[PDB]
Design a protein around this ligand. Sequence first.
Ligand SMILES: N[C@@H](CC(=O)O)C(=O)O
Length: 387
Amino acid sequence: KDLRYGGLVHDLLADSGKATPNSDAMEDAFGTWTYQELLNHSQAFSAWLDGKGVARGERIVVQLPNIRQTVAVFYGACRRGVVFVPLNPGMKPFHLRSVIADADPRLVIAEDETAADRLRDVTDLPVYSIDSLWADVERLRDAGAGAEAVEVSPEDLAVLIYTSGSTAAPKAVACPHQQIVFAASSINAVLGYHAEDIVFCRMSVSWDFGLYKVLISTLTGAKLVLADIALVKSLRESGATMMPIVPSLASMLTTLIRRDPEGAPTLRMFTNSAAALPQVTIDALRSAFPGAQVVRMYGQTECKRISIMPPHLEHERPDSVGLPLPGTTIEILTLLPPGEPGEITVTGPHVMAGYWRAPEITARAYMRLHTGDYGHLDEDGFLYFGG
Ligand SMILES: N[C@@H](CC(=O)O)C(=O)O
């Protein structure tokens, strides 16, 4: 439909960089880049990787907060077939050691010098602080470096997304370009982001919730705001129109909102996944923001997302997590008939390439993804947990 098959991640950027070069693409606490600027810095970073001899198919581990540079690192890596491995700042050191070793990167990018030092205890690989490596990036940007393309297959890995906690064996979903682009386009065919949206994203890009707000904004030409008591003010002052939520973040917002009758009237949508949104929270969001749709979704990192409740149906089938992503199938398992509880299984161009270097774990979950969640479809195709 508007669904993208066979796509490359960095092509999203190249398109918007040319289509709307002067529109605002990324804002963080420190400034704003237009799409041109984002394209230019991503190109520069690609030349920095070339300069360092990081090759197609290799990994970089990047442990950075939500700042513009991280998005440039992401796209610059994609443009060279290099695999982006985003990790959350604040991980415990033994946890980093485990994950870095598993990811097996060519180098590691840290948030600053203190952090670069802590990383150096836990790996022998080369470690660069973003401030220092960025001085080079800016030189390269100024010299116009990195503008050339290089061969990248839609089947090449773009990202590894670690889902394992610190008490678990390291485990990342292995994400090829095609699947990412497709999933972004399929999500967007339901949610309807567009070029005058301002997306307020409080989720780290180390989680696919944030990464896909980078991608969906880039896809549509929207503006992404990379973002505590101040939350309501941030929202209203950014002019935020779209906000991905998780239930704890929604409760906080409804608590905070009673203390501010100016609200944030620009908000038109909240999109919830990761956990079940309780009715009381939904009601409070609608009351504080009657202009906004509250949209239930369900997913796993293994295929990015599984179901979305169409926005226009937000008041119906209160127990459902919605319909399959467009271009994908859900079935319940031996195919069970409607109403019959079984394992939720998923088929489509969003199902990712398995877990990185873990044939054994991959084998049990994976061309059909077995989620280990249980539920049923009703007659219409809507998905429910349990019975
Ligand atoms: N990846 C899921 C959420 C999750 O796995 O926590 C989604 O974006 O719907």
